[PDB]
Design a protein around this nucleic acid. Structure first.
Ligand SMILES: [Ca+2]
Ligand SMILES: [Ca+2]
Ligand SMILES: [Ca+2]
Ligand SMILES: [Ca+2]
Ligand SMILES: [Ca+2]
Ligand SMILES: [Ca+2]
Ligand SMILES: [Ca+2]
Ligand SMILES: [Ca+2]
Ligand SMILES: [Ca+2]
Ligand SMILES: [Ca+2]
Ligand SMILES: [Ca+2]
Ligand SMILES: [Ca+2]
Ligand SMILES: [Ca+2]
Ligand SMILES: [Ca+2]
Ligand SMILES: [Ca+2]
Ligand SMILES: [Ca+2]
Ligand SMILES: [Ca+2]
Ligand SMILES: [Ca+2]
Ligand SMILES: [Ca+2]
Ligand SMILES: [Ca+2]
Ligand SMILES: [Ca+2]
Ligand SMILES: [Ca+2]
Ligand SMILES: [Ca+2]
Ligand SMILES: [Ca+2]
Ligand SMILES: [Ca+2]
Ligand SMILES: [Ca+2]
Ligand SMILES: [Ca+2]
Ligand SMILES: [Ca+2]
Ligand SMILES: [Ca+2]
Ligand SMILES: [Ca+2]
Ligand SMILES: [Ca+2]
Ligand SMILES: [Ca+2]
Ligand SMILES: [Ca+2]
Ligand SMILES: [Ca+2]
Ligand SMILES: [Ca+2]
Ligand SMILES: [Ca+2]
Ligand SMILES: [Ca+2]
Ligand SMILES: [Ca+2]
Ligand SMILES: [Ca+2]
Ligand SMILES: [Ca+2]
Ligand SMILES: [Ca+2]
Lengths: 159, 158, 159, 158
RNA sequence: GCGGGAAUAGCUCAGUUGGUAGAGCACGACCUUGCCAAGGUCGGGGUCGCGAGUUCGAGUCUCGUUUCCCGCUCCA
RNA sequence: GCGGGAAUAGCUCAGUUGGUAGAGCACGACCUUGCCAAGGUCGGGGUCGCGAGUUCGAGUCUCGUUUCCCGCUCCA
RNA sequence: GCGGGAAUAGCUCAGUUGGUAGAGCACGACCUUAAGGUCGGGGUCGCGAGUUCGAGUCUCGUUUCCCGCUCC
RNA sequence: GCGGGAAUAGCUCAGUUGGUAGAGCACGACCUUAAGGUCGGGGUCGCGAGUUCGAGUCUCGUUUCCCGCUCCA
């Protein structure tokens, strides 16, 4: 049983029953996702359970900057300071749907959206802070490369 | 002039002059290189039926801390605040007064609205290079920071 | 099973019952071992089943020389031509005793004997002709190093 | 009169050695000790009664000779090549000629070769005679010249 | 932009010297009793990134070009 | 003997323009629900062979010295 | 491994159809003008067995050395 | 989210014990040297409802904007 294609979070999605195992991700979804969509703090995208409005996973994007000091030499080569980036702020899949490949589908939609964004505005890389080791390996397998200074911070270059 | 289009190796930037040399040399030296590195997106309007650039603006993702941000900008916001930086905006002196600067800024602001549908963006932010530049941006809605007086913001009505 | 320490082949040792899996080696023992010991073509040393004359393993030594062309530059540095060597001509273990580590013990006795001999007469290295590739790996594992020309010819320099 | 044979070392004084054959003497002085270290030869010297001045020496090294240069006596029922010990060097300082020192050196060498042939296959001792005096000397002590190379002689070991 | 390093088999690499193409893993087949695991062998796959040059001879030396990596430079 | 190269963690190795040390394997602990083989993580681990010298500052440059390697030379 | 030869005086060798072991050299001595010659001594025929009236000699076995070929 | 403020003429604002809607700037004509002066025009008091004899004013609901704090490992 798969799920729908990603769609912007709205006031109609039921997020109350969402649990990812990571308290920060779940609490963020339930408390601030929609409010931020209104506030311009982030853009959230959800996939729902087949033919429901119950969210099975989500990712959130926001513009960002990384200082040269906290960036790897590869990233900062011939770049302004700070370096322009897009922050993959949140990426979480309900535990009930782990293994069905929802995280990989979400990350794929996110990367595509970041490409489309980069056509219009300067973006050196996508940046994520992995919350767990499972998360780090997830991102490393899908092309991301950990930092040298902060080893749980990963980047993916776009061009 | 032409309608806005991405910078490419084909645009004539060698004779571009805006009165701020930093902007002109930025165009000529880094516009395209940054286009390649993903440090900025530059858009130019040209002298009709030429590849001669008459004006441009550059966009880049960014963030501003709550301390350098106005309270309207940081209201109920994470830290830092996600923004799009109007990194560069210049018009050749040959085209001053025709209202081209406002057209450039407008195209840029629209592009940021379209972007804000896909990614979190609280405001457009610019570092005004002169007092004229600061006044221009204030005339088009921007509001100076309280801390840094040449940093101005323009909020995006979602 | 358990065997005595190595001793010269003689007319008292039962070599008719030797089987090692290698037909050349077994036929060599049975046909030429004792006569060559008499003729000085080789010196053979055997280990027997403690309290038997049944040969469980043997090695045969004989002087030799190798030309600069088949010698590695390490071997030939500042050396006459040919190079003086001692030839590990034969080394085989009876099938009843494989796995008991007897081949390595024999090789150890042989190397010791060559050291004692090099005390009296110039010897640059021990040289052996590996009969199998497994044998080559055995000798490489115990310190031997293949030549550049023939990889089944291996040397061991003496201290 | 001299000491009993002993291995060459950095302590033996060989600069004053003269045997009449310059090749042998220069070999002693230039290569004896280095070859002792390299495993190219094992050298043994007899000294001048409580000195480190060498009066004579012989050098041994393993070797093999092909059947073509072997006498039929040497190759009878033998592999090819034939394993031998090479008496590479044997020389007496002229100051001790006639005293029978060469025979004593050869005898010590032959004994050492017996003791070696106990441990490793050795068909014969082989020497390359440099002069006719030398060839006849080796022939007098039992050696037998080759059929092909007339300056190469063999001595079989019982 | 300046400097340095890299590019050799599907992957990871070795190749000091200017002198016949390499190893481990992967793949096809075979060997060990008929399958076969471990060990071994055979085979496919390389204009040694590409191109030009010196030499009797180039992975090796020379030059041009492509790409990647690492340090520094830098646009608030 | 002439020439070239090397020595950096228990092992195999990187280390840039002279600006205060790193990787893989190995080791101790943890994850794998626990334990266990594989995999992943965290962590500890160096007079950069030795000595001297230059320098504000040495893994880096100079010299000496110990050891090893590669090419050539060479004693039928 | 196959094949062939040798063993007799200190040395080199002879010893036909089986009948006490021969010649030169060498060695000791002598003759005279170191040489040549003469004189003198030494075997038991590698070993063992057998045939024979009788064996250096023939039969068989064996020891040692040598030569050609074979060969890992 | 907690707290505070704003909305009345084109603009800046007043209209406190609740009574046809007020001043300045600005706008049109005119006086004179385009500033000053004179004259003239413009609302329906953010919206809706309620109390009141009567609501710009009081009560409640609501719309938009603004300020301070809070905040997203
Ligand atoms: Ca659930
Ligand atoms: Ca112009
Ligand atoms: Ca058996
Ligand atoms: Ca002298
Ligand atoms: Ca470069
Ligand atoms: Ca590759
Ligand atoms: Ca390489
Ligand atoms: Ca080569
Ligand atoms: Ca078969
Ligand atoms: Ca192949
Ligand atoms: Ca090809
Ligand atoms: Ca090429
Ligand atoms: Ca390639
Ligand atoms: Ca190619
Ligand atoms: Ca040519
Ligand atoms: Ca080549
Ligand atoms: Ca190049
Ligand atoms: Ca080491
Ligand atoms: Ca190194
Ligand atoms: Ca340092
Ligand atoms: Ca020092
Ligand atoms: Ca450094
Ligand atoms: Ca040095
Ligand atoms: Ca015979
Ligand atoms: Ca006799
Ligand atoms: Ca005789
Ligand atoms: Ca005869
Ligand atoms: Ca006479
Ligand atoms: Ca007589
Ligand atoms: Ca007798
Ligand atoms: Ca008779
Ligand atoms: Ca409020
Ligand atoms: Ca109004
Ligand atoms: Ca107003
Ligand atoms: Ca007011
Ligand atoms: Ca009223
Ligand atoms: Ca006016
Ligand atoms: Ca007035
Ligand atoms: Ca109204
Ligand atoms: Ca009423
Ligand atoms: Ca109210």
């Amino acid at each position: 049983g798969r799920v729908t294609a990603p769609e912007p979070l709205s006031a109609f999605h039921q997020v109350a029953e969402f649990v990812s195992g990571e308290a920060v991700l779940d609490d963020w979804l339930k408390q601030k996702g929609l409010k931020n969509q209104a506030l311009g703090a982030a853009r959230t995208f959800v996939v729902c359970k087949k033919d429901t409005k119950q969210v099975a996973g989500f990712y959130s994007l926001a513009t960002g900057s990384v200082n040269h000091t906290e960036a790897t030499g590869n990233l900062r080569r011939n770049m302004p300071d700070p370096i322009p980036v897009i922050i993959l702020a949140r990426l979480a899949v309900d535990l009930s749907f782990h293994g069905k490949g929802l995280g990989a589908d979400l990350l794929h939609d996110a990367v595509l959206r970041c490409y489309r964004v980069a056509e219009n505005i300067g973006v050196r890389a996508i940046m994520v802070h992995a919350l767990t080791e499972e998360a780090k390996n997830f991102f490393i397998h899908h092309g991301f490369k950990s930092s040298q200074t902060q080893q749980r911070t990963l980047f993916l270059r776009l061009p």
